[PDB]
Amino acid sequence: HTAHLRTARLELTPLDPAADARHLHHAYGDEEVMRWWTRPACADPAETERYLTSCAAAPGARLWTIRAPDGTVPGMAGLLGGTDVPGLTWLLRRDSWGHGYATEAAAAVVGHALEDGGLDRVEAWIEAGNRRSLAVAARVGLTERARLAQHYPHRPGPHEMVVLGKARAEEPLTTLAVITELPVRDVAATLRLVEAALGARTAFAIGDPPEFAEAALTPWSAGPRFRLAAVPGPGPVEPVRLHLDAAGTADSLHRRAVDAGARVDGPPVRRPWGRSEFVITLPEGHELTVSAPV
Amino acid sequence: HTAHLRTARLELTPLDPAADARHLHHAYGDEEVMRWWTRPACADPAETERYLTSCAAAPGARLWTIRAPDGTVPGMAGLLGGTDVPGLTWLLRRDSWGHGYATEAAAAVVGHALEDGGLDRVEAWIEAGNRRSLAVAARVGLTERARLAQHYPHRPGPHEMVVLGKARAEEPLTTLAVITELPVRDVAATLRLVEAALGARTAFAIGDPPEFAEAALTPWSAGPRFRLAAVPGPGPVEPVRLHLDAAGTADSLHRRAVDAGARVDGPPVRRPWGRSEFVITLPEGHELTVSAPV
Numbered sequence: 179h180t181a182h183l184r185t186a187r188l189e190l191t192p193l194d195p196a197a198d199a200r201h202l203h204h205a206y207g208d209e210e211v212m213r214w215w216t217r218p219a220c221a222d223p224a225e226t227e228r229y230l231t232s233c234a235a236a237p238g239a240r241l242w243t244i245r246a247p248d249g250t251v252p253g254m255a256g257l258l259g260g261t262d263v264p265g266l267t268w269l270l271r272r273d274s275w276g277h278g279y280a281t282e283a284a285a286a287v288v289g290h291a292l293e294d295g296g297l298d299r300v301e302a303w304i305e306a307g308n309r310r311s312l313a314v315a316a317r318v319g320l321t322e323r324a325r326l327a328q329h330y331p332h333r334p335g336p337h338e339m340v341v342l343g344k345a346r347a348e349e350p351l352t353t354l355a356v357i358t359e360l361p362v363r364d365v366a367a368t369l370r371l372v373e374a375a376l377g378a379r380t381a382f383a384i385g386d387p388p389e390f391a392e393a394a395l396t397p398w399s400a401g402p403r404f405r406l407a408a409v410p411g412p413g414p415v416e417p418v419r420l421h422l423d424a425a426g427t428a429d430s431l432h433r434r435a436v437d438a439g440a441r442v443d444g445p446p447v448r449r450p451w452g453r454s455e456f457v458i459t460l461p462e463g464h465e466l467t468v469s470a471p472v
Numbered sequence: 473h474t475a476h477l478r479t480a481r482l483e484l485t486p487l488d489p490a491a492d493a494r495h496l497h498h499a500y501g502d503e504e505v506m507r508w509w510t511r512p513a514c515a516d517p518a519e520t521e522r523y524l525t526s527c528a529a530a531p532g533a534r535l536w537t538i539r540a541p542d543g544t545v546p547g548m549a550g551l552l553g554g555t556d557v558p559g560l561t562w563l564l565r566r567d568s569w570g571h572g573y574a575t576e577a578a579a580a581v582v583g584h585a586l587e588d589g590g591l592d593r594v595e596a597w598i599e600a601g602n603r604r605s606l607a608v609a610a611r612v613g614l615t616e617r618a619r620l621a622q623h624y625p626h627r628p629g630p631h632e633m634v635v636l637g638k639a640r641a642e643e644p645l646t647t648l649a650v651i652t653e654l655p656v657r658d659v660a661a662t663l664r665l666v667e668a669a670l671g672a673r674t675a676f677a678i679g680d681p682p683e684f685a686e687a688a689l690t691p692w693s694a695g696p697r698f699r700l701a702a703v704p705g706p707g708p709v710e711p712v713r714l715h716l717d718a719a720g721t722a723d724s725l726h727r728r729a730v731d732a733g734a735r736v737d738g739p740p741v742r743r744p745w746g747r748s749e750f751v752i753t754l755p756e757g758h759e760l761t762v763s764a765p766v
């Protein structure tokens with residue numbers, strides 16, 4: 179990793195923790211600049227230096243330092259290591275905001291990444307409230323692809339992350355969603371359960387009473403959801419297993435399910451892969467496991 | 473129906489096809505304005521009148537005509553009927569663009585719809601390319617909630633629809649994904665099939681051959697996917713029913729499945745609800761029905 183990236187007004191030089199740390203500290207040391215970061219602002223240029231090293235260390239991590247015409251070092255931008263599908267970062271010091279640097283830099287990294295960089299696509303996870311970042315990602319050409327929940331140990335609670343992406347390959351055929359059907363005796367009754375326990379809603383319902391319905395797990399369209407189909411009187415129903423990635427605290431999600439009178443596992447159990455989970459079992463046997471960051 | 477909306481500079485009067493059609497035809501009859509529309513530009517004011525009447529007829533439809541101070545009718549805006557999740561529209565005549573009318577009207581409709589409209593949320597499905605429309609939705613406070621694929625009869629092929637929405641209040645406990653598990657005999661075998669027929673990819677595996685894996689239906693960190701689990705007992709497995717909302721042409725998706733040697737119930741059959749579908753059956757019974765706009 180020694181690729182030098184040249185833009186209209188910037189020069190991206192391979193990040194060298196040792197010499198750059200001093201400059202990059204007006205960024206990582208700034209609490210206002212680190213508000214959306216995965217960790218608290220570094221206390222001193224030394225801390226910044228070590229962290230920049232672990233970051234640079236990561237497998238496949240190729241970070242660059244940004245140098246402006248005036249000879250300033252606006253900040254850093256590059257690809258994160260340990261993602262499988264190429265990650266993306268950047269951060270500037272306040273004094274260097276609103277100059278279209280981030281967008282110019284990020285664009286250099288992504289264009290390079292897809293160009294003679296050896297990558298078919300790139301990602302960028304940005305928090306929901308990070309307007310600044312989302313805007314840059316948009317300017318660069320990264321479009322939303324999914325959403326996930328995460329939790330930073332320094333933060334009091336979890337948060338939603340936006341997975342934006344861009345590919346040199348415009349995959350034509352692709353799947354937008356997967357709606358799984360659950361055989362149930364009383365669709366209506368189920369719908370009432372699901373709405374209460376999981377905060378779902380009836381996207382639609384055929385039959386009076388319902389014979390086949392769809393429970394939307396979000397108040398929008400084209401979101402997570404599963405269908406319900408009424409089962410033929412007698413005869414057991416082989417359980418269906420669903421994994422629900424939810425937003426919010428497992429405690430709240432659990433409190434809701436219980437208060438909704440649903441058949442729950444027991445309190446959420448902290449799983450090794452860093453996710454708290456608990457299971458909801460429907461009368462028919464079906465098991466809906468609910469997992470959150472915390 | 474009634475309701476008259478007043479803004480800073482505009483007056484939104486309940487749409488009256490008969491009276492307004494003449495004016496609104498400067499929009500509906502213009503090919504450049506009608507670019508991103510669900511149907512071609514209207515041939516004449518009469519056609520525009522007819523269309524406006526059906527639109528007005530739609531269940532729950534509440535449209536408004538936009539009148540400017542200078543006594544002109546820049547265009548129209550309002551709420552779409554029979555959409556389940558409150559819909560939204562708007563359009564202006566070419567010579568009325570770039571005046572902030574759309575944003576003003578739209579803002580009024582939304583503002584009215586959430587407070588005094590007795591509605592909880594509102595949506596706006598805009599095409600990826602429609603930059604001007606996306607900007608309006610933005611200025612109004614509509615944020616991306618999803619994406620879907622659609623096809624307009626007059627169009628040669630399908631397109632990507634962005635789903636933006638706004639709520640008087642958001643729900644914390646929401647689900648971001650639903651991963652369903654499929655009991656299979658040979659996880660490795662299934663994965664090879666799925667990868668071929670559904671262009672999937674193994675997000676991860678557990679074993680050699682894996683006894684538990686996850687097939688991501690997209691090349692991104694998050695998104696549509698299901699888990700495979702090696703069935704223990706050497707007995708029969710009750711099939712699971714999965715519905716996949718695909719992007720692209722049904723023909724293509726079909727060709728790919730067949731060429732991947734997958735068990736297809738037959739070519740794509742046009743379903744009444746405007747969706748082309750065919751079914752893929754996994755050796756263990758599981759039926760994955762694939763549906764695309766066309």
Ligand SMILES: CC(C)(COP(=O)(O)OP(=O)(O)OC[C@H]1O[C@@H](n2cnc3c(N)ncnc32)[C@H](O)[C@@H]1OP(=O)(O)O)[C@@H](O)C(=O)NCCC(=O)NCCS
Pocket residue numbers: 505506507508509560561562563564565568569570571572573574575576596597598602604605607608
């Ligand atoms: C409906 C729509 C997209 C209007 O475009 P628009 O006129 O640019 O939207 P506005 O009416 O909010 O105009 C905003 C522009 O006018 C400017 N403007 C001028 N005077 C203004 C004022 N007093 N207040 C606010 N903005 C003003 C804005 O700054 C902005 O300039 P810019 O976008 O060029 O940088 C229009 O282009 C259209 O008819 N599109 C086709 C119909 C369609 O596809 N609809 C989608 C179905 S949901």
